[PDB]
Design an enzyme around this catalytic site. Sequence first.
Site, PDB file in Angstrom:
ATOM      1  N   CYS A   1      19.902  -8.027  26.304  1.00  0.00           N
ATOM      2  CA  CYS A   1      20.741  -7.952  25.114  1.00  0.00           C
ATOM      3  C   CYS A   1      22.088  -7.313  25.420  1.00  0.00           C
ATOM      4  O   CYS A   1      22.156  -6.160  25.841  1.00  0.00           O
ATOM      5  CB  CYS A   1      20.036  -7.164  24.012  1.00  0.00           C
TER       6      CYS A   1
ATOM      7  N   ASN B   1      27.605 -10.213  19.704  1.00  0.00           N
ATOM      8  CA  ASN B   1      26.452  -9.330  19.727  1.00  0.00           C
ATOM      9  C   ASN B   1      26.290  -8.697  18.354  1.00  0.00           C
ATOM     10  O   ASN B   1      27.271  -8.312  17.715  1.00  0.00           O
ATOM     11  CB  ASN B   1      26.590  -8.237  20.786  1.00  0.00           C
ATOM     12  N   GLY B   2      25.052  -8.593  17.907  1.00  0.00           N
ATOM     13  CA  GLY B   2      24.761  -8.070  16.594  1.00  0.00           C
ATOM     14  C   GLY B   2      24.131  -9.108  15.688  1.00  0.00           C
ATOM     15  O   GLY B   2      23.389  -9.995  16.119  1.00  0.00           O
TER      16      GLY B   2
ATOM     17  N   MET C   1       8.126   7.893 -10.559  1.00  0.00           N
ATOM     18  CA  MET C   1       6.784   7.389 -10.296  1.00  0.00           C
ATOM     19  C   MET C   1       6.858   5.881 -10.118  1.00  0.00           C
ATOM     20  O   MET C   1       7.833   5.240 -10.516  1.00  0.00           O
ATOM     21  CB  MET C   1       5.808   7.760 -11.417  1.00  0.00           C
TER      22      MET C   1
ATOM     23  N   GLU D   1       7.653  12.682   5.599  1.00  0.00           N
ATOM     24  CA  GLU D   1       8.891  13.363   5.935  1.00  0.00           C
ATOM     25  C   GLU D   1       8.840  14.818   5.473  1.00  0.00           C
ATOM     26  O   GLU D   1       7.906  15.254   4.794  1.00  0.00           O
ATOM     27  CB  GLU D   1      10.078  12.638   5.308  1.00  0.00           C
TER      28      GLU D   1
ATOM     29  N   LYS E   1      11.589   2.588  -3.284  1.00  0.00           N
ATOM     30  CA  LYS E   1      13.039   2.473  -3.137  1.00  0.00           C
ATOM     31  C   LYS E   1      13.353   1.875  -1.771  1.00  0.00           C
ATOM     32  O   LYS E   1      13.624   2.606  -0.806  1.00  0.00           O
ATOM     33  CB  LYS E   1      13.725   3.826  -3.312  1.00  0.00           C
TER      34      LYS E   1
ATOM     35  N   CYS F   1      -3.578  15.149 -11.165  1.00  0.00           N
ATOM     36  CA  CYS F   1      -2.381  14.549 -11.739  1.00  0.00           C
ATOM     37  C   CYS F   1      -2.761  13.643 -12.901  1.00  0.00           C
ATOM     38  O   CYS F   1      -3.781  12.951 -12.862  1.00  0.00           O
ATOM     39  CB  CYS F   1      -1.611  13.757 -10.686  1.00  0.00           C
TER      40      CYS F   1
ATOM     41  N   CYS G   1       8.077  14.444 -12.028  1.00  0.00           N
ATOM     42  CA  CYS G   1       8.042  15.106 -10.731  1.00  0.00           C
ATOM     43  C   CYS G   1       9.420  15.626 -10.338  1.00  0.00           C
ATOM     44  O   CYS G   1       9.528  16.645  -9.648  1.00  0.00           O
ATOM     45  CB  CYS G   1       7.504  14.145  -9.675  1.00  0.00           C
TER      46      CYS G   1
ATOM     47  N   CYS H   1       6.015  20.124 -13.428  1.00  0.00           N
ATOM     48  CA  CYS H   1       4.772  19.387 -13.619  1.00  0.00           C
ATOM     49  C   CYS H   1       3.699  20.339 -14.136  1.00  0.00           C
ATOM     50  O   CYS H   1       3.491  21.404 -13.545  1.00  0.00           O
ATOM     51  CB  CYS H   1       4.323  18.726 -12.320  1.00  0.00           C
TER      52      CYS H   1
HETATM   53  C1  LIG Z   1       4.980  11.940  -4.825  1.00  0.00           C
HETATM   54  C2  LIG Z   1       5.153  10.923  -3.740  1.00  0.00           C
HETATM   55  C3  LIG Z   1       5.829  11.262  -2.577  1.00  0.00           C
HETATM   56  C4  LIG Z   1       5.991  10.322  -1.572  1.00  0.00           C
HETATM   57  N1  LIG Z   1       6.661  10.658  -0.418  1.00  0.00           N
HETATM   58  C5  LIG Z   1       6.819   9.722   0.578  1.00  0.00           C
HETATM   59  C6  LIG Z   1       7.493  10.059   1.740  1.00  0.00           C
HETATM   60  O1  LIG Z   1       7.948  11.191   1.878  1.00  0.00           O
HETATM   61  N2  LIG Z   1       7.652   9.125   2.737  1.00  0.00           N
HETATM   62  C7  LIG Z   1       7.142   7.855   2.578  1.00  0.00           C
HETATM   63  O2  LIG Z   1       7.287   7.024   3.472  1.00  0.00           O
HETATM   64  N3  LIG Z   1       6.471   7.514   1.425  1.00  0.00           N
HETATM   65  C8  LIG Z   1       6.313   8.443   0.421  1.00  0.00           C
HETATM   66  N4  LIG Z   1       5.633   8.110  -0.729  1.00  0.00           N
HETATM   67  C9  LIG Z   1       5.077   6.731  -0.916  1.00  0.00           C
HETATM   68  C10 LIG Z   1       3.704   6.667  -0.263  1.00  0.00           C
HETATM   69  O3  LIG Z   1       3.844   6.879   1.122  1.00  0.00           O
HETATM   70  C11 LIG Z   1       3.042   5.319  -0.490  1.00  0.00           C
HETATM   71  O4  LIG Z   1       3.912   4.291  -0.080  1.00  0.00           O
HETATM   72  C12 LIG Z   1       2.724   5.156  -1.966  1.00  0.00           C
HETATM   73  O5  LIG Z   1       2.201   6.367  -2.456  1.00  0.00           O
HETATM   74  C13 LIG Z   1       1.714   4.044  -2.201  1.00  0.00           C
HETATM   75  O6  LIG Z   1       1.588   3.845  -3.588  1.00  0.00           O
HETATM   76  P1  LIG Z   1       0.127   3.780  -4.251  1.00  0.00           P
HETATM   77  O7  LIG Z   1      -0.414   5.184  -4.303  1.00  0.00           O
HETATM   78  O8  LIG Z   1       0.224   3.226  -5.649  1.00  0.00           O
HETATM   79  O9  LIG Z   1      -0.789   2.918  -3.423  1.00  0.00           O
HETATM   80  C14 LIG Z   1       5.477   9.043  -1.728  1.00  0.00           C
HETATM   81  C15 LIG Z   1       4.802   8.705  -2.892  1.00  0.00           C
HETATM   82  C16 LIG Z   1       4.639   9.646  -3.898  1.00  0.00           C
HETATM   83  C17 LIG Z   1       3.909   9.276  -5.152  1.00  0.00           C
HETATM   84  S1  F3S Z   2       1.040  15.260 -13.259  1.00  0.00           S
HETATM   85 FE1  F3S Z   2       1.582  13.521 -11.981  1.00  0.00          FE
HETATM   86  S2  F3S Z   2       3.293  12.281 -12.851  1.00  0.00           S
HETATM   87 FE2  F3S Z   2       4.233  13.902 -11.598  1.00  0.00          FE
HETATM   88  S3  F3S Z   2       4.742  15.791 -12.733  1.00  0.00           S
HETATM   89 FE3  F3S Z   2       2.625  16.015 -11.885  1.00  0.00          FE
HETATM   90  S4  F3S Z   2       2.538  14.512 -10.143  1.00  0.00           S
END
Ligand SMILES: Cc1cc2nc3c(=O)[nH]c(=O)nc-3n(C[C@H](O)[C@H](O)[C@H](O)COP(=O)(O)O)c2cc1C
Ligand code: F3S
EC number: 1.4.1.13
Lengths: 117, 1472
Positions: free
Chosen positions: B1, B231-232, B479, B886, B937, B1102, B1108, B1113
């Site tokens: 590459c 490239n790219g 959420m 993370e 996201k 929860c 959150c 909470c």
């Molecule tokens: C409160 C919370 C924190 C999360 N933090 C991370 C994160 O730090 N890094 C990451 O890759 N995914 C994070 N996730 C997403 C989860 O890794 C996973 O993709 C998700 O919880 C799956 O959804 P489900 O529980 O409905 O199956 C987080 C999810 C929640 C609810």
């Molecule tokens: S109850 Fe559940 S929806 Fe969030 S503020 Fe606490 S993790």
Amino acid sequence: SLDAQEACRCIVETEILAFGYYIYGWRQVPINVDIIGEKANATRPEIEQIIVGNNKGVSDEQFELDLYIIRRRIEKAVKGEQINDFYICSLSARSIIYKGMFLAEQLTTFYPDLLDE
Amino acid sequence: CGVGFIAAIDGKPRRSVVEKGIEALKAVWHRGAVDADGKTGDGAGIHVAVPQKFFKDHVKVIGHRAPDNKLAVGQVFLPRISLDAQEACRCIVETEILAFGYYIYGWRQVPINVDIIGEKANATRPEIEQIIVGNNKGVSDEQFELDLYIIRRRIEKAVKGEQINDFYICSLSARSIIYKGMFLAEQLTTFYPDLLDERFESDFAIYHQRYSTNTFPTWPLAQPFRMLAHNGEINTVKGNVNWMKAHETRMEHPAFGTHMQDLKPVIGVGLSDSGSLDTVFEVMVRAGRTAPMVKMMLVPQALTSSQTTPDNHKALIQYCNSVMEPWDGPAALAMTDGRWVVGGMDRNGLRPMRYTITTDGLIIGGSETGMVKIDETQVIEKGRLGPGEMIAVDLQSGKLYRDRELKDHLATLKPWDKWVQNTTHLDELVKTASLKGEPSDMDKAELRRRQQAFGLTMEDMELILHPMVEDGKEAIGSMGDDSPIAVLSDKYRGLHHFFRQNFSQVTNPPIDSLRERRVMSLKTRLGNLGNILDEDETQTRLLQLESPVLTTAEFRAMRDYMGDTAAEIDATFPVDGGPEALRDALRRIRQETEDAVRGGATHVILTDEAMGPARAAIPAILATGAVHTHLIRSNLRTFTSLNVRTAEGLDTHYFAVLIGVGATTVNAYLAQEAIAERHRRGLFGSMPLEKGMANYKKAIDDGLLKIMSKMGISVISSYRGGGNFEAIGLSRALVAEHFPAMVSRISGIGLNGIQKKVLEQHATAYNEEVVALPVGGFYRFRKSGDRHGWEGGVIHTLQQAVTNDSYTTFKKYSEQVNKRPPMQLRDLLELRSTKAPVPVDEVESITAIRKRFITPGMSMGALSPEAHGTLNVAMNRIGAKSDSGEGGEDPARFRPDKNGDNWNSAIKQVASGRFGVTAEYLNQCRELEIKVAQGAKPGEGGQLPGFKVTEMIARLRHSTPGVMLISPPPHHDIYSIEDLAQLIYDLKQINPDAKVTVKLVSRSGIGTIAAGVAKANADIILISGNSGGTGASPQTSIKFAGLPWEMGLSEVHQVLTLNRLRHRVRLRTDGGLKTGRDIVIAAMLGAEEFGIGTASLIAMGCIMVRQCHSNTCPVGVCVQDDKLRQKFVGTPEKVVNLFTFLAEEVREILAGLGFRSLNEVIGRTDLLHQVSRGAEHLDDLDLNPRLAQVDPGENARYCTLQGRNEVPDTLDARIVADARPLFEEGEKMQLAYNARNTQRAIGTRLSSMVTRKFGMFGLQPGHITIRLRGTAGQSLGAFAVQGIKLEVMGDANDYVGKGLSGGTIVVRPTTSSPLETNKNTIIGNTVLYGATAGKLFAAGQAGERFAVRNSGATVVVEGCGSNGCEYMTGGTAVILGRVGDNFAAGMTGGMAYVYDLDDSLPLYINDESVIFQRIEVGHYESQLKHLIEEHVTETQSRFAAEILNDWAREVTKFWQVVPKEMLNRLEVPVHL
Ligand SMILES: Cc1cc2nc3c(=O)[nH]c(=O)nc-3n(C[C@H](O)[C@H](O)[C@H](O)COP(=O)(O)O)c2cc1C
Ligand code: F3S
């Protein structure tokens, strides 16, 4: 690739619905690639079936006529975009065709559908 | 590459150029895709000048007479299977060349050697031939090249006429030739022995090697191309092609003549992005312009509004951006005209490009600074290419133009300043428009009746509107989205809910927008399109707006300016028209538009202003789509513009899709009326109305930039009308007919369903007697609203079943949840076997099934320490795997507790922020995980509010307490798949026992990305869906981004099985998994492991508050308070019981179906059938693309290998075989070696051994030292711990000191180098990425993004580039020289010192969050003095030495840069 399949499906569905007929859906023919050789397998296409029903209440005669016209138009439209390895082995309300690049005695093994009652 | 180019400055042909090109090609084998064959490549090529003497002696030997003029030779690929295609193509070529009058000397068969090509690269090998044509008419070179190009185009068209396959022309010219193929890079001179001749001398050479994502090679797809090498990866090609389709219908030039006619479809079929860009470039060059001008016109510089450039360049860039749409994306270009040779970079400067001048009048440039071996005493200057820069060489006169010289020389051809003054703004037009014509406000009842007709509820005005008007920013949710998909829902969901947004996995980097917002433009131009092959003052006379969204007053002013040339079109259809009213309305409007445009109209205003009790409104998206598509198909879109007045635009996702469909400007008046009505009631306080409107427009523009930045597009002109969305649930006919380029893998409702929904809502609103709007439930549950996934009954019953520990309760839970009407894709499919049931005691035990479940990642910033620890303890008790996510982890939790409870986590994440990634954090796990994009996201970084950061989190992340922490969307380490392979190699070197997991997000095109990452030695792929939870993210990214995992999982499985790669990797899925049926369906689809996530949180307590992000909470799951953390009620037994029930449910289902193990059901798709909801809905969802069965062959349908995919050894191996006394007696050592650019990550495995033996801080500084002589590779000294000292004599390529963990690196030039150490680049891009400790002293200048995300490191370097010290967090950085633009952006901790002789720092710095002053404290003076003394001591520099000599007069030339948030926390104040 996964575009040619989608592009051809879109073309077929746009060209059938331009007349007014009702599409019941697609079906994937069950096959068995255990009997095909190598060079006859590197060019194996994806075999599918499309089920269209007549809802306008037209006669068989006009129905066969529009089916032929639709086949020709689909062929021309697909050739328009220079899409390769696309073919229509039959499109009619009377007869069907099961063909391939296998041995003669192994026809009922590649196509188990013909083993039905 | 990589790309590369060698040029003789004086302009005389010579053999050394060519062989040095070959030598550079022979040393790029480390970046390519290794294969177990050793013969299969993926594309390589070289592009040189024509060896006249070779072919002239050939002709002489043949028996003709050698002419006096230059020769022309064309290289062709003919078919090989049959003997007609060859003859037919030869006849076509010979009939088409002789039609002009030129003389054909004959054909020649190129000697080749098929001994080196693999198999799959040999089944499609074409027949390579050459045709020799000579010029006998005595025409000039210029006309000769012109007719050759025209002949090539005509031959291409004629051959395509007859549908002849596998025909290609690699070149046809009298100046240059191209040798390319599908072999390895080093085997180029073996396949083509012609290049081994003595007569192949040239004055320039370009070479390229690629890295393809699939394993099906196509020979006509290998670079370099004819007058281009890339490239790219280009982002915007689905939009640039559509705009070329409109530009073609007006372009003409007298150089071509009548022949212009065969160049009308300039961008043919069967090309990639690098092919279409090349075609456009060649067409624009062959018509008069020069290579630098075309490069500036297609890939322009970022037009920034600062005083750091002469206004000449600003006017030139204005003209260039006004005449053409940019071609964005990461792009390192090395192109050549017949005279010029140019090397250039894109707007953002993502890929690297480094060059070198030698005393032989020879310039060598490429991706790595160690490809061609060159004695150090022969160099004159080393350099780099910043963002938007370019370097040119003129061969005719033999000169070398750098960036600024070339810009100056180019800005004098035409009077740009006098031409740009023709532009007219609207800001002045709305200023001079006197304050008259104020319209009377609409009545409240009329407003409510119109709002009810579109389905707007009060929650759309209190939740997602009010924050826009008050704050100027956008709403936030916390959420996952459990709402049903659009087609399966039952209320009135607008048409803008069927379009999911797009983003970019590894193949492209997303563009962060909170820091480099200076390169993103929203300029809009009306009256712009025209002839692109001209140069005159009439091309820059148009109307210019600063944002595509217009208010009502601005719309009235622009309509004033338009006036007597515009034409308005209604978009309403009669409610009583019949069963086909909508289609007839579409027909009517798309006919009237064409009949009006042909009548001289120049502006079309498409409005639904006439909506009444008997006329329903056409959905604006459908209207603008039909109109734009028809105008494109009728060669009229080039004439007019397209303005839309809509009555539904309230959210930032509407404007995005409207501008993506093709609209020019968008006016939303109902939203402004609602804002005014809410303001007159005294709801905003004391703010005026104009301030509220300005805040609303600012928020809309910010959200639009966010949506545009998820994909990598930085300009709106190239994003408009490209349609980078994706429709899920629309009929294939409708999409393929009314929308330019979108894929609908499953058909949906046609026009009848849309008409029924629209008529139903219109009747409800205009015949029923409205008094108030419904409350509405879309983001929060309300009994009157829609249905949801997680609700009160199911949650209470699940918590009861988990707390009391009884199974029948859990079956009651599953029975409740598996009985609602369908809400997701996996609700329509049905299990159906043909064997006989087997008893329950015969299936696998719960143990081996529970070890297949894991817990997804949830950071410690979001969750509370107690819940995180509880999850980690519960998941380790049953033998499964947990995840830390993370945000790092606590070191003190690294030992098993004396309760036995192991609080560690078996899976560690490498986020894009690298917040706690150290050398010990990666050696305390069994299995690693790379996170590219999250499910909720996608194309975005996690957030953390400013009050969520306590002492514990600030210490755990090495950040500043009380500061908002937003992760960067891009990766700064992963800009393409080669960088991903490099990072995977790094991770597999630092930890010799773990596996590497890649986490993607389900969308279309994920199959090719998955087939590509599998070749990068990744062994676990994770596919998340759009239904995943999160900590904090905007609502538009939650509800309108991603796709269900049912699509992506099946796509990845089929694509991996097709490429014979499924037997090497494992598949893991999560998102919305609740019961055992869901797990069995996912296992049938192809997955092998499963993640749960949200359900686990419900087992711990929860209750789905969805607050959150508020740090309040109630139960105490995700909160950083103490008074609320004291309310936690979680315990591991709950989670253990949940997993036990979930596994035994799968056992039940398997025993009932007829199998005895999950391995016998994985991949068996034919056990699933599709049944639809009935004959009363008529949604035509066909899930057959989802149920296709690709036959594996001899391999199984899952992973069948042991351990991780193996990797080669770098130099470090020898070191470990040499420094045995250090590891066994523990004594000092000292080693010396010769480095080369084909050796990556030097000094990482040694760091791993040292960490395992003594730890990070167990050795004194400088215990083991290594002296490398040569050019270091990439990732030199990545993850080095204290006690290791690397000293490089030469230079380092890239990522030097990535993630430094206490070590020490020193880079200096050779003692016999005749170079100014303060004027030559010595290290590349992304230096010290996420370091926490150590020191790094360099004796040159650094590249771009110098010291990003620094946390504790200390660096002293004699220069810097653009975007330096970006988003730094801690440490010190001394820069003894000039800086780049946008310096210190997003800095939030640490300190910096700049040595300013030009006194030009206030022009480059980003004075937003940092302050810059002069040194006034002796305490801060001793710091700088000691740092420079240590620099002089180590690198023995001469610049810093004489700075230290004259200290008293140079101490007053330094600027001190300190963050704003570090003003209350420094140890002594900075002031007096
Ligand atoms: C409160 C919370 C924190 C999360 N933090 C991370 C994160 O730090 N890094 C990451 O890759 N995914 C994070 N996730 C997403 C989860 O890794 C996973 O993709 C998700 O919880 C799956 O959804 P489900 O529980 O409905 O199956 C987080 C999810 C929640 C609810
Ligand atoms: S109850 Fe559940 S929806 Fe969030 S503020 Fe606490 S993790």
